[PDB]
Motif scaffolding. Structure first.
Motif, short mmCIF file in Angstrom:
data_model
loop_
_atom_site.label_atom_id
_atom_site.label_comp_id
_atom_site.label_asym_id
_atom_site.label_seq_id
_atom_site.Cartn_x
_atom_site.Cartn_y
_atom_site.Cartn_z
N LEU A 119 5.34 -5.15 13.54
CA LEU A 119 4.30 -6.14 13.11
C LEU A 119 4.06 -7.45 13.88
O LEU A 119 3.09 -7.81 14.36
N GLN A 120 5.16 -7.83 14.35
CA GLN A 120 5.12 -9.03 15.26
C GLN A 120 4.64 -8.76 16.58
O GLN A 120 3.69 -9.48 17.03
N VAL A 193 -6.35 -0.60 1.42
CA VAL A 193 -6.58 -1.14 -0.12
C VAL A 193 -5.11 -1.40 -0.78
O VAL A 193 -5.16 -2.70 -1.07
N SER A 194 -3.98 -0.58 -0.56
CA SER A 194 -2.84 -1.02 -1.22
C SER A 194 -1.91 -0.26 -0.36
O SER A 194 -2.10 0.85 0.61
N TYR A 195 -0.74 -0.46 -0.56
CA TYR A 195 0.45 0.16 0.16
C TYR A 195 1.66 0.20 -0.80
O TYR A 195 2.24 -1.00 -0.96
N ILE A 313 -2.51 -3.28 7.63
CA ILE A 313 -1.66 -2.48 6.55
C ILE A 313 -0.26 -3.15 6.50
O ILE A 313 0.00 -3.37 5.34
N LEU A 314 0.09 -3.70 7.49
CA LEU A 314 1.58 -4.23 7.27
C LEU A 314 1.79 -5.51 6.67
O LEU A 314 2.67 -5.99 6.06
N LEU A 316 -0.09 -6.16 3.97
CA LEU A 316 -0.02 -5.88 2.76
C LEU A 316 1.28 -5.27 2.19
O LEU A 316 1.50 -5.09 0.94
N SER A 317 2.19 -4.85 3.09
CA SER A 317 3.25 -4.16 2.54
C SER A 317 4.45 -5.12 1.86
O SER A 317 4.90 -4.41 0.72
N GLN A 318 4.65 -6.11 2.37
CA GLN A 318 5.48 -6.98 1.65
C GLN A 318 4.96 -7.53 0.17
O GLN A 318 5.74 -7.50 -0.75
N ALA A 319 3.40 -7.75 0.04
CA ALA A 319 3.02 -7.86 -1.12
C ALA A 319 2.83 -6.47 -2.01
O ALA A 319 3.26 -6.54 -3.07
N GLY A 320 2.63 -5.31 -1.39
CA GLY A 320 2.59 -4.29 -2.02
C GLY A 320 3.84 -3.47 -2.39
O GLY A 320 3.87 -2.53 -3.37
#
Lengths: 320, 506, 212, 493
Positions: A119-120, A193-195, A313-314, A316-320
């Motif tokens: 991601l970085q 949308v979501s993950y 996408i990435l 939202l991964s921490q929040a999802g």
């Protein structure tokens, strides 16, 4: 160390004058090729016509001596740099490297246990840089093969129904699978949308998208462990572009191996999908891809657009 | 529609460096209508380096913008859109203009320093390409002057293109070769003549050398004969003076129809390359000859088309058109019979054809196989239906082969059925212009689709007796004439039926 | 060793046409410990003057995904390879002659991918009887009885080929006529194509079963 | 068909071996009316010679190393075209003096102008000589001057490339003759006619009937003299590139379409352009060295290699070789070509053996259960001919086969050989036909083929790592392992 520049006068009287190359090589092994600097964290400059500028760097923290290395970058033609360790920003050596070096090349296969490091790397692409990671080159036949199914005019309307996609990859890093998913989404105007995440023996992920018709989209990745990785981790095994409608034409499934044809059960699995076969596309060599990418130079539109979706996408991964 | 939205963009290729295409003969309103419209379209999709300065050349000189005005003038008559007008603005600034005299050796000194000055203005890389596009009689004087000034000397930075045609007879072709050979190398001269970059022609090789069944039965052991056919349905347009001194033997049989022949009786090359392929084309051309040379009436028939019917509307005869001279002798329909003398094509005759004002446009390469030894399945209709394999290089491109199968019914019978495969219904991609492909190749440099030097001599030698014999003056009432809208003149049909085979109705 | 020229197997519970289907040792009549095969694979080899060293594969079955009969002949590779593929994938030319669903003859060959470079992609031609000749609804029993009444025996065996066929198949039959070993029978789920051992049989040499 | 008269210049003459290699041959040619009576020869070099000294030395040479002078009046009629013009090799003034002498000789002798230049200088002087020859412009007209360069044409690829580039910049590639090799006008034409005039031997020459071929060349004489010559070359630039690479080209060549030199040479280059070794990465399945030690020959003792005069007792120059080449075209794909050579081996012989394949299925029984397959045995050494072996029936009431062969020797239906190969070479050089000579492409391709093994064996190594075979045994056992790794055996010969 101070003899690096003085000895060059002796070499000047004594050639290869082209673009230079740089390497890092974390590994302790071994401890147009114009100026090869074999950093491996003193000075061992000796140019032999394949001039050698190899410097023995057994002591780490050589950033300070890198000031003259930046002066020793040989600014005459566009040059290239290899960074085969990891992504980082705290280590200030990268910042000097990106501003100085014309272009850099990385591989998305040697990454360590963390996955957010990619991601970085993805974030840095949005900022104007020059990264041409070779892992994208390995998707050249898969992308070409996917476009082969829909080529004839009869299946023209089939592409307007695609709702279900599943990806099967070797257990481990999913960098190769996420890139493919981002590519197809960009070509059909999809948005994240979501993950979620479902850890287990297969590491079943889950991503959901929207559409102009706002129909729900479902996709999943399976980490089937084969325990027989061929010197390279994280490669595709198969994919399935299915359908969830009532009167849909048909799907498409691309096997790759004997075990990879395990999706021939349930309802229509071997009936509602037309099964093809591919010989083998996996575990390539780093040398051949490097040469081709070295030959070309510039900016790629396809790579940037695919990496744009991957960034969303990435995040939202921490929040999802 | 929108075929394969997965196919936005995946390819990777690039022309290496900028250059200045010093188009000769800027007058004559031909460059303004053929070349400049072609390059401008390519620039719109970014297929060229950023700056492509074009230096028009002519005896007469105009203003810098006045020359640009005629460049736009021809654009509109073939306009395919302009988008934002600012695109032409940088284009208008990119194109420069100079002048001089064609036959003045010192005029090039004015020229040479001019583009050299533009080199200091742009500093892109420095590159010269010449596209002399004037009357054939101007070919020698233009070439010699370039050598005198010597402004083309770098083997990698200089390319010279010669426009169609190349000569009249064998003595004419050799004369041009001596001039160019002494002043230029072999990897610099391009001879675009054919416009045969049509995608199907380079497909005639992959289909033959990448398969395992189609090679073993391609030699004198199975094939019977080969019929190569080309036909059109457009008569001689009012520009007849150019065609008057040409004849259909020298127009589309020495340059076009022989290329289909060299690609059908050649040996498999060792490895794909530039010279490893064109070297194989020469070998077959050095072992071919007419069927009979003493009695020329057995290996060639001329003709001419007279008044008839084409599309339900009356059509005037050839000796009625606005410009032709009554009681002429220039042929229009030509047919030959070539033979090949080597170890794999011994005794298999080739029949060639062409013409004008024929019923419809086609192009075929029909191969006919032998007959089965035993004839247990005699069946009906004398079984006179040997199986053929026919390619196609015209509308409805594809490959079709015929073979026999059993007819339903208790009694034994044999019908005739064929299985085919067409490019339109298997790929779903529209065709592409052939001219654009050749121009792009003139930048990278391949010399694969352009004929070599010594090869063009062999093409002229093969029809040596035919051209000379017919050119002699003869009785005006001695050339067979055929109606407009029918296939062949009466005499030409007898050539094929004597051996026992019939022309493909097609 | 008969593990390189034959593999048996029964069929068990699975999914068929969107509905569940019972397994073999759960149906009326059959005992719950039967060992009767329902899938046989073989590998013949003809040793005359023109088919030397060219192997023949055969496989029947039951409860397979779809009803098809076929005969596929695969040609050899080219002696020399110069043209590269478009997807690093190489395939050989194959001739097939379908029988049951829609009788016809098919053939496959390579051709160039339109573009700017030289690459090949697989393509095929086609021919079907129902689109050229017509539709036939003949009944085999009718023709058989008419031939028997008249007498033009061509489709009837001479009993010499009967003895020959029995001799060809005898070793496998004797081997498979064995004691019970109820738990030593491979099983393939009703709906799949074959048990994994036949897959291994074909892949020990390199070629793969045609995924019809 | 006698060639037109002209004058000869012999650079670096009056040295060693030039007399015995030229004067008897030209004398015999002139005596046999091979040349018109208007033939002259001219000397060269720096030592202060004399015309009478020239006559005396030529008389001594012909008397000692030839049949004789024949009739004295014959020598009197000959002795008018032998002059001399002393000059340094790199002296342009001496070159102008030579040009003036040639002009005077043309005006007086009336040789009509045509000339042939013969070069016989030491091989380390070709560049300066050619450059200074081209400086004065002695080679302008096309049929007026032909230059012949003696052995060897360089040592490694780079030297050959430099020599080619130097030669290309002086004269057109139509007059340079590289002589080289020794295959005369008998074997080459005989083999080509035998191959391309029959309707049975041609269809059985592709890869679906032939299995492998072997090519053998053997000699029995020791190192003999020229120890200094041999020590700098070894038996890889002496017999495995000049000679042994011609049998391969002639055996594995596609049919031509004509007879003149153009088609033959083009086909030879095309064949040679698609060959390679077997295992480039690992040089243990594509090469074996050797060296001959002390042994028994002809019932007498013969010393080993490291006992001759002039050779130090630590040298590692090979005297044996063995390669395994392979062709990669549409006709010979997958058929190995085992090569061979050597020295001190017994039974001096050359051969070309082709071994066919076995039948599809076997229904008969062999006496020894071996079933030796058929063989063609083209021969080149004495007793030339073609021999082929097939199967027959053992007499008796049983079905068994036994190998028997036909035979056809050129020495019965023929036997009147042509003249010395040197005489025919000189006549062909005078008249002009490059069929038997070599172009630049052939030389460069042969060097490229042999480069890897040559470079590997050139590097220094352990002094006692050379596989050794005594004088008399066929080869060291390593070659036997190389051939038996696959099963096919060395021809017993």
């Amino acid at each position: 160390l101070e003899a690096i520049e003085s000895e060059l006068a002796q070499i000047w009287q004594t050639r290869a004058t082209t673009f230079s190359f740089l390497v890092y090589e974390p590994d302790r092994v071994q401890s147009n090729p114009c100026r090869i600097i074999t950093l491996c964290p003193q000075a061992q400059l000796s140019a032999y016509c394949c001039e050698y500028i190899t410097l023995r760097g057994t002591s780490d923290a050589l950033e300070r001596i890198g000031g003259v290395i930046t002066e020793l970058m040989l600014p005459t033609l566009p040059k290239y740099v290899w960074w085969k360790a990891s992504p980082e920003a705290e280590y200030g050596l990268f910042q000097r490297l990106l501003s100085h070096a014309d272009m850099i090349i990385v591989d998305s296969s040697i990454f360590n246990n963390p996955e957010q490091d990619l991601l970085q790397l993805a974030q840095l692409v949005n900022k104007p840089e020059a990264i041409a990671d070779l892992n994208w080159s390995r998707l050249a036949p898969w992308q070409e093969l996917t476009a082969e199914a829909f080529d004839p005019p009869e299946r023209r309307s089939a592409v307007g129904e695609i709702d279900q996609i599943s990806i099967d990859y070797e257990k481990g890093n999913h960098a190769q699978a996420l890139m493919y998913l981002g590519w197809v989404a960009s070509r059909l105007q999809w948005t994240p949308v979501s993950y979620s995440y479902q850890p287990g023996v297969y590491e079943i992920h889950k991503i959901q998208f929207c559409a102009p018709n706002q129909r729900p989209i479902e996709a999943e990745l399976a980490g089937l462990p084969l325990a027989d990785t061929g010197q390279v981790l994280g490669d595709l095994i198969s994919l399935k572009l299915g359908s969830t409608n009532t009167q849909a034409q048909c799907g498409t499934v691309l096997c790759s191996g004997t075990v990879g044809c395990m999706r021939m059960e349930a309802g229509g699995g071997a009936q509602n999908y037309r099964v093809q076969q591919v010989t083998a596309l996996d575990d390539q060599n780093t040398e051949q891809l490097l040469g081709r990418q070295l030959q070309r130079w510039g900016r790629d539109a396809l790579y940037d657009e695919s990496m744009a979706i991957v960034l969303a996408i990435l995040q939202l991964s921490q929040a999802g | 529609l929108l075929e394969n939205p997965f196919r936005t963009g995946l390819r990777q290729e690039r022309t290496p460096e900028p250059l200045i295409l010093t188009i000769f003969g800027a007058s004559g309103d031909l460059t303004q209508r053929k070349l400049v419209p072609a390059i401008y379209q390519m620039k719109r999709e970014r297929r060229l380096p950023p700056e492509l300065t074009v230096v028009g050349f002519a005896r007469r000189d105009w203003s810098h913008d006045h020359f640009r005005e005629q460049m736009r003038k021809g654009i509109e008559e073939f306009s395919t859109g302009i988008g934002s007008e600012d695109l032409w603005n940088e284009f208008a600034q990119g194109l420069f203009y100079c002048s001089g005299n064609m036959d003045d050796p010192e005029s090039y000194l004015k020229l040479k320093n001019f583009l050299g000055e533009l080199d200091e203005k742009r500093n892109t890389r420095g590159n010269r390409v010449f596209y002399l596009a004037v009357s054939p009689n101007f070919f020698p004087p233009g070439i010699k002057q370039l050598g005198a000034a010597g402004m083309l000397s770098d083997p990698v930075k200089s390319r010279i293109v010669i426009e169609k045609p190349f000569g009249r007879d064998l003595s004419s072709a050799q004369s041009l070769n001596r001039v160019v050979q002494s002043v230029c190398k072999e990897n610099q001269v391009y001879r675009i003549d054919h416009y045969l970059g049509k995608e199907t022609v380079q497909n005639l090789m992959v289909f033959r050398f990448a398969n395992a069944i189609f090679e073993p039965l391609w030699n004198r052991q199975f094939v019977d004969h080969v019929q190569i056919t080309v036909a059109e349905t457009v008569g001689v347009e009012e520009r007849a003076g150019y065609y008057e001194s040409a004849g259909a033997l020298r127009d589309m049989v020495q340059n076009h129809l022989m290329q289909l022949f060299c690609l059908t009786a050649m040996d498999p090359p060792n490895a794909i390359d530039a010279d490893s392929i064109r070297n194989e084309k020469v070998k077959v051309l050095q072992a071919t000859r007419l069927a009979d040379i003493n009695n020329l009436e057995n290996a060639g028939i001329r003709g001419q088309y007279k008044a008839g019917w084409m599309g339900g509307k009356p059509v005037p005869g050839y000796r009625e058109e606005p410009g032709v001279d009554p009681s002429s002798t220039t042929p229009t329909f030509a047919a030959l019979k070539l033979m090949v003398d080597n170890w794999r094509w011994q005794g298999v005759p080739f029949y060639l054809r062409t013409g004008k004002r024929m019923p419809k446009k086609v192009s075929e390469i029909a191969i006919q196989f032998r007959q089965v030894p035993l004839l247990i399945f005699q069946s009906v209709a004398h079984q006179a239906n040997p199986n053929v394999l026919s390619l196609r290089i015209q509308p409805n491109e594809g490959i079709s082969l015929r073979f026999e199968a059993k007819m339903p019914g208790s009694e034994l019978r044999t019908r005739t059925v064929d299985m085919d495969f067409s490019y339109g219904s298997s790929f779903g991609v529209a065709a592409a212009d052939a001219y654009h492909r050749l121009l792009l190749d003139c930048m990278l440099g391949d010399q694969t689709l352009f004929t070599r030097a010594d090869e063009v001599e062999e093409a002229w030698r093969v029809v040596t007796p035919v051209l000379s014999a017919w050119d002699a003056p003869s009785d005006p009432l001695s050339m067979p004439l055929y109606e407009a809208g029918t296939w062949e003149p009466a005499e030409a049909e007898w050539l094929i039926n004597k051996d026992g085979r019939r022309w493909r109705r097609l």
